Amino acid sequence: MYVRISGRIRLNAHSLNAQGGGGTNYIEITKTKVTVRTENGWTVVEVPAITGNMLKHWHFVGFVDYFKTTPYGVNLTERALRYNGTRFGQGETTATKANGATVQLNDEATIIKELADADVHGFLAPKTGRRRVSLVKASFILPTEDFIKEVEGERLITAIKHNRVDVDEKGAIGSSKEGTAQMLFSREYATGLYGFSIVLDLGLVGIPQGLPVKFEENQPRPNIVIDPNERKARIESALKALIPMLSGYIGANLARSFPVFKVEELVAIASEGPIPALVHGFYEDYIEANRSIIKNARALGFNIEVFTYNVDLGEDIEATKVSSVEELVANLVKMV
């Protein structure tokens, strides 16, 4: 089922999704140009951010973590166990399976039915040319527009040095001729009131893209290949994989940095039918825009439920109040 959860978080001293030193100790983090008004024209300013690839990979990590506990997690890629983001990266032939079998890149529907890792995040098997668009279109992580407007500066990035001190069997720091292992590096750590918007098209997970339906007697049902129980378990695990995202299990340098997170304002929409996606948290009128789109979609007619985290939003809206993220996804999966 289609679920779109957007909102804002607060970050302090995070080195998430660095660009990398590229031989330099000053580890570049990812930057992005953003438009702000500042009452003198919407000029573009460079601000720290992390890509949607970060959120996609960490959603995959939560996916495999939750399948490590579900009884139906046996059908998973052995690469997926080690948080390996690669999905058929090289032009291989027979993919290894954690169960102890192998997968052949033929009859894509068979891979969809059997393998569960490449059902929501897609795959790009390059030798057989079998591709599948993913169903987790993760967004970027950018601050609030008025935040940058009202700071008119105060770079959200700080440079902090670190060193890997050498001590040897003789108790010394080897300079050149007895071990040149002592090393320093400067890392960039960022902060700010960032926003995110995760769209999740779980409605056709487990449905091969080649033949989503059959229409044998003109009926509106998808061409399912797996039993409904396993599909529902996969949907629940994929949606619960969003729980560690909104708590501090995303970004790079998760061991050394481990960014601090919070729940400030979250708006979530959930429905079986196709619904418009919300706006990535970057602006000030995003709450108003979300309220407008929800009320207009309800006017059109949709079986869509809205979950709000202590936000004003507005009146004449049947949105349900939420208090955290795991209870939010529990309420989302409350029906089967």
């Binding site: 330099t24 100790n25 000053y26 930057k31 000029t43 573009v44 300013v45 460079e46 500066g153 105060e154 770079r155 990035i157 440079a159 040095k161 400067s186």
Partner: protein, 107 residues
């Protein structure tokens, strides 16, 4: 024009001989995406200036030359005049780019 002297001193930080390296300050003054950390790194270089002077007059090299005050205030006026991040980043990178050049300081 007014980049040679300060760029010369910037290259005095890391060059042949001069067994003391400081690339964090160069990196900070190069990618000065905001209005500051540029003058911060330049001041850090100016604070290591006595260290460079002592090392030069001690080991093998002629004493280093501090950038002229007119150069410093020319840089300050240039960074005051600019407002867009484009000019600030261009000035910062052009300033810190001279730190890596073939200079025959110590004969």
């Amino acid at each position: 024009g007014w980049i040679r002297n300060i760029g010369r001193y910037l290259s005095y930080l890391v060059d042949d001989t001069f067994e003391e390296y400081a690339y964090d300050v160069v990196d900070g003054i190069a990618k000065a995406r905001t209005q500051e950390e540029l003058l911060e790194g330049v001041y850090k270089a100016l604070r290591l200036a006595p260290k460079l002077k002592k090392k030069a007059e001690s080991k093998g090299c002629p004493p280093p030359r501090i950038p002229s005050p007119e150069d410093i205030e020319a840089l300050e006026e240039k960074v005051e005049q600019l407002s867009n991040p484009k000019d600030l980043r261009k000035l910062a990178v052009s300033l810190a780019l001279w730190a890596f050049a073939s200079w025959n300081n110590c004969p």
